């Protein structure tokens, strides 16, 4: 739920 990024 925490400490996860995101790339697009």
């Amino acid at each position, epitope marked *: *739920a*925490v*400490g*996860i*990024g*995101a*790339v*697009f």
Partner: antibody, heavy 120, light 108 residues
Framework: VQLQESGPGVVKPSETLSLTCEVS???????WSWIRQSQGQRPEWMGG????????DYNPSLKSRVSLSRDMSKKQFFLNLRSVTATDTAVYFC???????????????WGPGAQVTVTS | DIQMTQSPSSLSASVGDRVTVTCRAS??????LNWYQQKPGKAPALLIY???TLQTGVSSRFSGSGSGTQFTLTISSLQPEDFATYYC?????????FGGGTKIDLKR
């Protein structure tokens, strides 16, 4: 992606433990953490940060002693552990956690780990 | 902080067995639990995340279930390469915390 830890393998007690992580890399933000693990023990998450802001989250069992930062231009992110004792002897991993929302993959990248030993 | 209680500390199994590893959370952690395999000298490798999603490239005989506080990792047909230590990891809240570990070894 690939991560690689780097820094001294021996640190005198009371001194500061410093390590670098070389991050290999296309538009977004990563969560970079340091997770350490002493022999015969479970891993301990020390802290993490988001690469786009550098805002840190710290494990309360260390908070005063641990510092994290990153340099996007050099693709590095750093650990400083102040006033170490012999019980800070551990293997230190840098790990990257991020979801590719285009492909819906989860990605969980660990370095090979750097053993550091606190001793005089 | 939340803490996982892993069970059993070690578990004896033969090649081909169906084997179960369990993780208990002190608080409700929804389905924010991950399962790791670790071999000696190596970094832990992610097998299952979000309680039941199989990570890319992981063999399909690995499976996870549970929600709330009770979670289970099942190895359907244990192979020699499965002999390792396994950790659960909660990422429902900070700090991330790991279970105590389960070393699966060869039965004799």
């Amino acid at each position: 992606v690939q991560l690689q830890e780097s820094g001294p393998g021996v640190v005198k007690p009371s001194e500061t433990l410093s390590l670098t992580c070389e991050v290999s890399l296309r538009v977004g933000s990563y969560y970079w953490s340091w997770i350490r693990q002493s022999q015969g023990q479970r891993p301990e998450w020390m802290g993490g940060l988001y690469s786009d802001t550098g805002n840190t989250d710290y494990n309360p069992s260390l908070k005063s002693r641990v510092s994290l930062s990153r340099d996007m231009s050099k693709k590095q992110f750093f650990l400083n552990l102040r006033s170490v004792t012999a019980t800070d002897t551990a293997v230190y991993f840098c790990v990257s956690r991020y979801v590719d929302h285009w492909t819906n993959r989860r990605f969980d990248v660990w370095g090979p780990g750097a053993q550091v030993t606190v001793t005089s | 902080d939340i803490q996982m209680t892993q069970s059993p500390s070690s578990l004896s199994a033969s090649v081909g067995d169906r084997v179960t590893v369990t993780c208990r959370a002190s608080l409700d952690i929804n389905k924010d639990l991950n399962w790791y395999q670790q071999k000696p000298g190596k970094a832990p490798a992610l097998l299952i995340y979000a309680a039941s999603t199989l990570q890319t490239g992981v063999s399909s005989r690995f499976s996870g279930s549970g929600s709330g506080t009770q979670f289970t990792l099942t190895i359907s047909s244990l192979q020699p390469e499965d002999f390792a230590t396994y950790y659960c990891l909660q990422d429902y809240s900070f700090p991330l915390t790991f279970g105590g570990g389960t070393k699966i070894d060869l039965k004799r």
